[PDB]
């Protein structure tokens, strides 16, 4: 990450260096077009973080969840899905805890 970009800022080469990531920018206008919500699973502590960059890069709102957090925010984020008026379509979910 440092040898590619030492500035580690929001860059266009975040989603153009990988193969899932270029196609993910192909669907993100279309996911915003289709209006159907998408649940995506990731590995812990690293793949979600760079996905937090990319969904913020195309400016699609998103939630998150993990294992070393507290349980207070767990049930509240369940309640935020049950409201249908969510402007966020995609969000981030875990396999081992979630």
């Amino acid at each position: 990450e440092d040898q590619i970009n030492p500035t580690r800022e929001t860059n266009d080469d975040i989603w153009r260096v990988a193969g899932k990531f270029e196609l993910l920018d192909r669907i993100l206008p279309k996911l915003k077009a289709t209006g159907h919500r998408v649940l995506i699973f990731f590995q812990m502590t690293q793949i979600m973080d760079i996905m937090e960059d990319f969904l913020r890069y195309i400016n699609i709102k998103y939630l998150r969840l993990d294992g070393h957090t507290k349980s207070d925010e767990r049930s509240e984020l369940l309640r935020l899905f049950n409201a249908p008026d969510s402007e966020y379509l995609c969000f981030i979910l875990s396999t081992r805890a979630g």
Binding site: K70, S71, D72, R74, S75, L78, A97, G98
Partner: protein
């Protein structure tokens, strides 16, 4: 039940059935002292742990 789905079972223990009391176990140990010394004698219908 698992820690991921605790309150949803308890919310369904509220809406789908009344008169069944529920005892939870979560978080820091300070809040448990109020419950598990009050219901130390075990006046409940369900412990949801």
């Amino acid at each position: 039940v698992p820690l991921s789905t605790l309150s949803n079972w308890s919310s369904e223990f509220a809406k789908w059935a009344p008169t069944l009391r529920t005892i939870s176990f979560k978080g820091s140990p300070n809040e448990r002292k109020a419950k598990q010394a009050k219901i130390r004698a075990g006046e409940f219908d369900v412990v949801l742990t």
